[PDB]
Each structure stands twice: as C-alpha cells, then as structure tokens.
Amino acid sequence: AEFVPPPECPVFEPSWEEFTDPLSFIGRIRPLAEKTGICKIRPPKDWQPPFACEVKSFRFTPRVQRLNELEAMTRPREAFGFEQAVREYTLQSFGEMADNFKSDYFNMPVHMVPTELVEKEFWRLVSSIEEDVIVEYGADISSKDFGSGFPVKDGRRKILPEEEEYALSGWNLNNMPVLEQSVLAHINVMKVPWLYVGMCFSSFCWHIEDHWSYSINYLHWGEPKTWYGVPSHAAEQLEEVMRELAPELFESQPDLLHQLVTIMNPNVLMEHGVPVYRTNQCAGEFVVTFPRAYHSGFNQGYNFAEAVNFCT
Ligand SMILES: O=C(O)CCNc1cc(N2CCc3ccccc3CC2)nc(-c2ccccn2)n1
Numbered sequence: 214a215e216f217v218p219p220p221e222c223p224v225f226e227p228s229w230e231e232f233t234d235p236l237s238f239i240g241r242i243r244p245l246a247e248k249t250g251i252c253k254i255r256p257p258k259d260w261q262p263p264f265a266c267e268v269k270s271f272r273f274t275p276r277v278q279r280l281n282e283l284e285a286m287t288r289p290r291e292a293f294g295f296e297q298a299v300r301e302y303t304l305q306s307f308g309e310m311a312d313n314f315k316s317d318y319f320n321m322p323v324h325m326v327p328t329e330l331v332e333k334e335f336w337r338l339v340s341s342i343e344e345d346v347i348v349e350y351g352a353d354i355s356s357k358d359f360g361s362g363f364p365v366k367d368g369r370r371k372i373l374p375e376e377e378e379y380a381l382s383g384w385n386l387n388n389m390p391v392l393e394q395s396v397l398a399h400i401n402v403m404k405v406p407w408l409y410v411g412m413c414f415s416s417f418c419w420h421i422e423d424h425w426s427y428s429i430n431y432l433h434w435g436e437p438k439t440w441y442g443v444p445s446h447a448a449e450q451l452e453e454v455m456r457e458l459a460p461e462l463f464e465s466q467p468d469l470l471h472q473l474v475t476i477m478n479p480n481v482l483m484e485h486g487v488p489v490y491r492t493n494q495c496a497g498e499f500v501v502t503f504p505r506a507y508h509s510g511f512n513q514g515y516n517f518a519e520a521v522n523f524c525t
Pocket residue numbers: 350352353409416417418420421422423430472473474518519520
C-alpha cells in the first residue's frame with residue numbers, strides 16, 4: 214500500500230499592500246489557517262532577499278538520523294549505539310554529500326526526482342526493517358554563529374543599498390516580535406532565529422512549540438521542505454493517538470521527551486480521525502505554524518531554512 218498524500222494546506226499570495234506587515238496579515242488569515250494548523254505564504258515576485266550568511270566560515274556537525282529507529286525496536290544488534298558518529302561539514306561539503314546521496318539513491322539527477330516520490334519512499338523507509346537508511350540533519354544552528362540568512366544592520370557584515378529594505382523588512386525573521394507579555398517580564402532586570410541545513414530524508418518529529426507559540430519558517434534556498442500539520446483543535450486527539458501507537462516503553466514519557474522520537478505516518482493519524490494537511494515549501498516561501506498546531510516534516514534535498522518563534 215502506497216502513501217496517500219494528505220490534503221494541501223492553504224497557500225497565500227499576498228499583494229504588496231497586504232505584504233506591508235506580517236502580524237496584521239497573519240491575523241487576517243487566521244480564521245482559515247488555524248483550522249489547518251499550518252499555511253504557506255508566497256511573497257511578491259520581486260521580493261527576493263539576499264543570502265547573508267558567512268559562507269566562507271560556515272561549518273557545522275549535523276546530527277545522525279536512523280529513520281527506522283522506532284520500527285527497529287521490534288527486533289539488540291551487535292554493538293548498537295556505534296552505528297555512525299557525527300562529523301563536521303562545510304556548507305559546500307554537506308551539499309556535495311547531500312546531492313550525491315539523493316542522486317545515487319534514486320538513480321536520477323536530483324532535480325528530476327518528483328516530490329511525491331521522495332514522500333512515498335520516505336514513509337516506506339520509516340516503517341522498513343529490511344533496509345537501514347541513515348541521513349544527517351544540520352539542525353539547531355544559531356543565527357549568532359555565522360549570521361542570519363537575512364541581512365541584519367548590526368555592523369558585522371556589509372549590506373548593499375538594494376539589500377537594506379530586506380534588513381528592515383517586517384518579514385525578516387530577525388524583526389519579528391518575540392517578547393511574551395507577563396508580570397515576570399516587569400520584575401526581572403532574547404530569542405533569535407535558528408538555521409537548519411537539510412538533505413534528502415532529514416526529518417523533524419511531530420511536536421508543538423514551547424509555550425504553544427507561533428512559528429514562522431523561511432526557506433532561503435535549495436530543494437523543498439515537505440510539511441505536515443494538525444490544527445490546534447485536534448491537539449489532544451493527536452496526543453492520545455500518538456501515545457497509543459508509540460512504543461509502550463515511551464508511552465508514559467513527558468511531552469518534551471516524547472517529541473524527540475515522534476515520527477509517525479500521517480495516514481495512520483488520519484485513519485484515527487486526526488485531520489492532517491501537507492505542503493511543499495519551496496525556496497523563497499514562508500510557512501507559519503499556529504499555536505498548539507502539531508507539525509512534522511522532512512526535506513526533499515539540500516536546502517537551507519531559518520525559523521523563529523513569534524508572539525502576537
Ligand atoms: O527544519 C526546520 O526547518 C525546523 C523544524 N522544526 C524543528 C526542528 C528541530 N530540530 C530538528 C532536529 C531534531 C531531530 C530529532 C529530534 C529532535 C530534533 C531537534 C532539532 N527542533 C525544533 C524544536 C526544538 C525545540 C522546541 C521546538 N521546536 N523544531
């Protein structure tokens with residue numbers, strides 16, 4: 214049985230007038246987008262920010278992902294835990310590895326592999342015990358390490374005159390409001406975007422953000438990032454289904470720890486009555502996750518994303 218793609222989440226193509234500030238736009242589209250958990254926003258055609266990361270020094274140690282680790286629990290192999298150690302890549306060397314992996318895996322040029330094929334094969338590999346596929350995920354790279362993907366007027370990197378509008382734009386993830394209101398905030402006497410370098414099959418589990426926060430994600434360049442989302446009204450329904458289908462050894466684990474391994478086929482959630490929506494986030498497009506909207510996904514290939522939590 215092949216994977217059945219969930220219905221598509223809403224995609225918005227705002228005009229220049231509607232693109233004037235994100236918080237007003239997200240607040241207007243919320244009656245529809247909050248019913249799907251996630252939504253995609255395509256900026257106007259002429260809105261093309263530069264890539265402002267320090268590429269000459271960009272290096273990272275991506276985490277190793279055993280895609281079928283949950284299904285493998287039904288088997289202890291000899292010397293388990295020593296499968297593959299983490300290594301350091303550059304932005305170039307990671308891309309060379311990523312493109313070579315995908316082209317070798319599908320026996321096709323990387324740009325010719327349909328998004329539906331990677332999606333179908335990803336969910337087959339997750340539940341396969343006959344094949345052990347291992348990928349790497351350059352996740353949790355702080356924008357403070359090598360700079361944000363967006364230009365920032367902090368004096369650390371040169372900004373051309375035609376790039377200044379992107380350093381001051383409200384859609385620049387460094388210009389999103391992040392300070393939550395509370396009484397403690399008036400008693401005590403800092404959040405920044407995070408970067409994610411992906412390859413084919415690199416994935417993130419079903420989870421919600423801390424404090425049920427909104428999140429916005431921008432794909433600077435590369436192959437698409439495939440998303441799955443669940444609206445907040447079905448959050449407790451997903452949690453009960455996920456706990457019933459997770460291994461019994463993890464069923465009583467707290468949410469913050471359970472979310473570290475929650476890779477689950479969306480078709481199984483949909484069969485249990487959970488509404489799920491999907492999207493392919495392409496280069497230059499935004500994805501907004503709404504409060505308490507569970508979401509997961511994987512990368513179609515070598516790409517570079519930036520994400521931050523924002524408050525309303
Ligand atoms: O890849 C992207 O574009 C962002 C995907 N979303 C992620 C991705 C992500 N990472 C993906 C790598 C990974 C893989 C497996 C388990 C945990 C993690 C955490 C880092 N972590 C988080 C996270 C962390 C803390 C609180 C809330 N969210 N969110």
